[model samples]
Target chain A: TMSVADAHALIKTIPDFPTKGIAFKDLSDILSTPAALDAVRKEVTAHYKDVPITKVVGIESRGFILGGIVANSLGVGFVALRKAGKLPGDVCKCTFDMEYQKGVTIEVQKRQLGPHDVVLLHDDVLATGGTLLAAIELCETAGVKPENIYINVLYEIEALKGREKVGQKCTRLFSVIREHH
Target chain B: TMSVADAHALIKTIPDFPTKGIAFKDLSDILSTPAALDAVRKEVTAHYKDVPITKVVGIESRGFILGGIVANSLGVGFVALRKAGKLPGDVCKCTFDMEYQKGVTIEVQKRQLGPHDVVLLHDDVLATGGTLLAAIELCETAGVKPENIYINVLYEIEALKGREKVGQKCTRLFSVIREHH
Candidate 1:
């Protein structure tokens, strides 16, 4: 078992990616290395082994990679919160703002969740907390009870204050790595 | 093991998704079911058991769900070719046209592959062959030889002739189901 420190080191940072004055944390480097992947898988799934989570819902794109693995490892169902206009079913969408007032939509297939389901909202990185908040809102639109929703991430940039905003909607929050500015 | 027929039956179609006149094939339902997921997993990983693949590179978003699993199952590395502006490093980009001539870019982190690496490109479906073609081009830009490249999909819309377009680029291509109009 490797420490989160080791896993964090595997993350590669790129300056001004997709935007200026932002350092993006890329996990592809870690994902391409078998041992580093194992360490991340172990650490992310370690805390929730006994949490009785029924569905592992991940944000589209990056979140799917880690969230899908966690869902399979836990022997549970996996749900996707995809971008606007991508899903092929009756879906519930939540639009959120990103940098420069730009907005993106995250959606979930309707009727996939119910009051009985316990969902763990997972994403690779918690940057602005906007996506997580939107994902949680998406679950709400899909009828997932707020109390049953759990939030987790591979890492969060401490300076971004995403955790503070996200923590308002999620009662339980866990992460493998926290990066400081 | 559920046969491909059973697994294929799990796919549901929704009319006019992301636009009018496009019937979208959704795999989220099958992926949520434990037995169906196992069957799809077995079927996807079955053919490649004897093929020596060093890396499983999946296209962005939908592809990641299965590609990550296949990489881990084969005990190989997993690399992601994501939508442009998402990946955070030196990357190689390939742009391709979709419905309405909208251009979508798929990119890989630069220098992630080499001449010695045999990459298995996995995606959920082969619709127009444009994205897969772009993904292969993205790999080529990163220095992966075409002879070592293989492509696989969960399903293909036969009416679209995506296979013919994709087949021209690589010798080996596999899919779980082929759909017709």
Candidate 2:
């Protein structure tokens, strides 16, 4: 039986990715390792197994990976919180600041979530929590209350203090691995 | 029990998206619908359940969603075939022509697959089959034989003859929906 710690051990830290002076926690190794992937799915699913999550909303790209798996395991649908102009439908957009980028816009199709729906918002990594905050904003625009929304991420860069920013909105935040850099 | 046909019906065809003269089959609706998403996962999993698939390699973005769910259901790992400059480690790159754009490059991390690994390469849409071909090339570079590879997609634009182009390389190609323009 593989544990979440075993899966976290497979993550590779690469120096200066997308820009300089940044250490990227790459999940490539864990994603390609069957045991590690299985461990992550089991751990994340078990974490929110009791929650009546109606939807699993994943941020674009990396979020889609684990988010979809978690949603499927919970027998719920997966919603895509995408970058600007990605979704070809009426969408709700939110702009936020990131450690690396500013004024980034994320969008989700309108009406994907409602007040009655309990949502699990997922992303692969939580850095400054800008993107995750933008995701929460979009959910709120769709009438999903902050208390009804749960956030889960594969890794957390504790040095960035992203948890503090996101924790202000949604109280239920879970991370499989916490790295203090 | 939901079938593949039931899920396909949820796909919305958006006209003149990304550019004019293209009816993009948007998967946003199906993805946000619980029953539709569940149907897709079950149908695709049942299709290749007999195969000894080692890894599920999904193309960037949309592919990541269903691909990850499929990989988890099959108890295998998920590998990402990303666009250029997205991956942080050593990678194998392939360039191919797309219907809307020319000279598109895709990359997968080196050593993700080998001679013994059976890969299921998946993408969300098969338009001109260019992207899937590039994925196959990347797999081949990783020493995974074409015979050992299986290709699956959620939607195929039949008018473009993508199936024929892809069929030349891999014998197994499965699509949940066939759309004719």
Candidate 3:
């Protein structure tokens, strides 16, 4: 049986994804095992049991890995926070800063979220925090209520200080894997 | 509230898609509305309640639209039976004959299914028995009992005699919309 420590120990870092000087955290290795995935799902669910999450929003691409299943296990909905102009019909959008001046925008449809929903955001890893911060913005803009929102990530990269920034708006923050090495 | 009849009427047939001489049943027309999609889900679930479906296998792409939702509501797993070479790992493949001796094959991962599972097959339309036959054969090869399987289609284009061709193998069959048009 895989425990939370087992999940943390299995995550690997691959340097330079879309561009140079950037490191991407990969979950495929851990997700390949059925037991590991089941453990990860149970861990995430347990961490947020007191938070009252009405929906689990998965960002386009990787966030889909855990978010979709998380919603299913919790008996809730999974909303996609997609790239600009990708989602069908009208969507609400928000922008967040990156390293310096440049920022990225995330969008979710207005109908996908409302004031009554309390969303628990799930993603693969925490690096520069561009996508995570942007998702938090969309949660608020879609009327999900800032106080009801929380963010959970598998690993936190200390070099980027991503946790400190993203934790500001969320009710709770968790790191199944926090790397200091 | 739209009945199964109303949702069934919305499927529009478009010819020559992905390849020439092939008809693609576009479901975007039916899935675009919340009422229509929800109605389709409830109707599909109600039809399979007492039948004890262990899994909902959606064919390739279009079948995945509401298949996942229906499977979700039924508290069953949703598996996507894809075209040749799409799914990774070892998969069982089967080919079946259509109207012109023309046909297609579907691949199901061996690890995803077993003899204990009662698979409820789903497709947008049943024009030719080709894909359904292939899916059934694939499931059989994976050891699912003959009497434990079923095919549920949204529309049946009569005069094709598709029901007569593939109905002999396993469990019963159901078509939400039956018409010669």
Candidate 4:
């Protein structure tokens, strides 16, 4: 079994990705190694082992991998939180603001979930918390209770203050950032 | 454990999605239900049970869920074949033509895979087979040997003629559709 520290070692730090002055922590590095992938699935699933989660809501693109593994581990179902117009059927949409007044949207297929289902929202990174919060809002719009809902991520960028802002709205959020490393 | 036929019942058909005259099979319906999700994963993974696969290459978004679960079940690593700019690494890219002069590119990180690694290319649907062929092209570009490669999909559209097109380039492809439905 690989430790949380080893998972960090597997992550590659790319400089000036998508823009300059930004150091992007690429999680794709750990995906190639079996032990590293097992470590992440173990850590994330174990973090919420006792949560009685009925379903896992994974933010699109990246969260699908992390959330799907954890959902399989928990013997529950996996749901997608995708960009606008990505879902085919009827959907509940959540639009939020980003930097420079730029707006982004996410949606979930309606009627697949219910109030009794305890949801755990999963994503790859908590960069600015916009996407995570928007996922929560999508759940809310779909009638999933906030108290029964939770959030978990593979990494949290401390400098971005994502955890702080997210903590204000969500009390049961989980993060697996081995900060002591 | 649900049968393959039962899992097919869980899929929803939406007309004219993302384009006209296109009947899109939305697999998202099966994901939110445990029995359906397990059936699809079991069916796909079981088809390649005897193959010595070292990794599963999943197409972006939808493929990630199915591929991640099957990779974890096989105790191997999961790799991503994403749209051109999504991967933040030294990636090898393959650009191909879609319908109506529309070109799309898919890529994988370079040097992470080689001839010894047996890769199973996975996606949710096999429509037109353009994406699947391109993903195979990516494995070829990354030096993963043709004999060591394979393909699996949740469903296939007979009318689209994707299977025949893909069969021309790859003979080891597998699908859970069963075609009798």
Strongest candidate by TM-score: 2
Per-residue lDDT of A54-133 in model 1, one digit per residue for the tens? 88898877788878777777777788888877776677878897533358877788867777889999988888888888
Per-residue lDDT over B107-167 for candidate 1, one digit per residue giving the tens place of the 0 to 100 score = 8888678778889999888888888888888888788898889999988888888888887
Pairs in clash, predicted candidate 4 = none
Q: Indicate whether candidate 1 or candidate 3 has the larger lDDT.
A: 1
- Candidate 1, after superposition: displacement of residue B168 in Å? 1.4
Give the C-alpha miss distance for residue A160 in model 4, angstroms: 1.3
Judging by TM-score, tell me the better candidate of 2 and 4.
Answer: 2
Where model 1 places Cα greater than 4 Å from the true spot, the runs are: A1-3, A99-102, B1-3, B99-102
Candidates, ranked, DockQ: 2, 4, 1, 3
What docking grade does candidate 1 earn? medium
Rank candidates, TM-score, best first. 2, 4, 1, 3
Listed per candidate, the RMSD to the true structure in angstroms reads 2.1, 1.5, 8.0, 1.9
Find the 10 residues in a row with the least total lDDT in model 3 chain B.
Answer: B26-35
Could you give the interface RMSD of each candidate, to one decimal? 1.3, 1.1, 7.1, 1.1
| Residue A58's lDDT in candidate 3 | 73
Off by over 4 Å in 4: A97-101, A178-181, B99-101, B178-181
Better of 2 and 4 by DockQ: 2
Better of 1 and 2 by DockQ: 2
Q: What TM-score is obtained for chain B in each of the predicted models?
A: 0.95, 0.95, 0.86, 0.93
DockQ of each: 0.66, 0.82, 0.08, 0.77
* Interface quality of candidate 3 as DockQ: 0.08
- Give the per-residue Cα lDDT of candidate 1 at B32: 77
